Scaffold this active site. Structure first.
Site, short mmCIF file in Angstrom:
data_model
loop_
_atom_site.label_atom_id
_atom_site.label_comp_id
_atom_site.label_asym_id
_atom_site.label_seq_id
_atom_site.Cartn_x
_atom_site.Cartn_y
_atom_site.Cartn_z
N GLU A 35 0.76 -1.14 -0.12
CA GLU A 35 0.06 0.09 0.07
C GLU A 35 0.97 1.41 -0.11
O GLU A 35 0.56 2.13 -0.63
CB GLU A 35 -1.03 0.08 1.29
N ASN A 46 -7.95 9.91 -5.48
CA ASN A 46 -8.76 9.09 -6.54
C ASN A 46 -9.58 10.02 -7.20
O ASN A 46 -10.66 10.53 -6.63
CB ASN A 46 -9.33 8.12 -5.91
N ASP A 49 -13.51 9.47 -8.04
CA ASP A 49 -14.80 9.41 -6.90
C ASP A 49 -14.34 10.52 -5.84
O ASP A 49 -15.01 10.53 -5.11
CB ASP A 49 -14.83 8.17 -6.35
N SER A 51 -12.04 10.88 -3.55
CA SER A 51 -11.49 10.14 -2.22
C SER A 51 -10.01 10.39 -2.09
O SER A 51 -9.42 10.21 -3.11
CB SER A 51 -12.13 9.09 -1.92
N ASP A 53 -6.61 8.39 -0.14
CA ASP A 53 -6.24 7.23 0.60
C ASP A 53 -5.02 7.79 1.61
O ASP A 53 -4.12 8.40 0.88
CB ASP A 53 -5.69 6.14 0.11
N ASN A 60 -9.13 5.00 2.96
CA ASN A 60 -9.84 5.78 2.28
C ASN A 60 -10.74 6.82 3.07
O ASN A 60 -11.43 6.47 4.06
CB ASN A 60 -10.66 5.02 1.51
#
Length: 130
Positions: A35, A46, A49, A51, A53, A60
């Site tokens: 990750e 992102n 959408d 959002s 992370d 998220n």
């Protein structure tokens, strides 16, 4: 901060992650590896959408933490997203334990499915004395 592999393994051990909901430490290590490369400062926005992370586990902002700017945010960890960019990962660990209390468990992170599921993940904890 960027953890060293064994340094992170022992920290996760102390914070109670080994066997938490049946997930070994080697599986949490494979997840942090892919990750963020064990980097607590990692963020990924992102654009599709809207959002982001956050942190070592790339948790998220739509479901888990709140950053104020993500549409339809749930904040299931009841945590500011900035708590996941700290060098101390205790808050990131408490929210990661919340994520896996859902039935999907660690499968919630697709990178775990791609990179760790059905693989030998014990080389991630080997030699750490954990």
């Amino acid at each position: 901060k960027v953890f060293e592999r064994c340094e992170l393994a022992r920290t996760l051990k102390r914070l109670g992650m080994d066997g938490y909901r049946g997930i070994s430490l080697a599986n949490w290590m494979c997840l942090a590896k892919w990750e963020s490369g064990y980097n607590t400062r990692a963020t990924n926005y992102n654009a599709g959408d809207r959002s982001t992370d956050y942190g070592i586990f790339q948790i998220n902002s739509r479901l888990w933490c709140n950053d104020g700017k993500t549409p339809g945010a749930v904040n299931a960890c009841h945590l500011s997203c900035s708590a996941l960019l700290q060098d101390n990962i205790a808050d990131a660990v408490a929210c990661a334990k919340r994520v896996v209390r859902d039935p999907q468990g660690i499968r919630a992170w697709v990178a775990w499915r791609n990179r760790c599921q059905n693989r030998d993940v014990r080389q991630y904890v080997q030699g750490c004395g954990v």
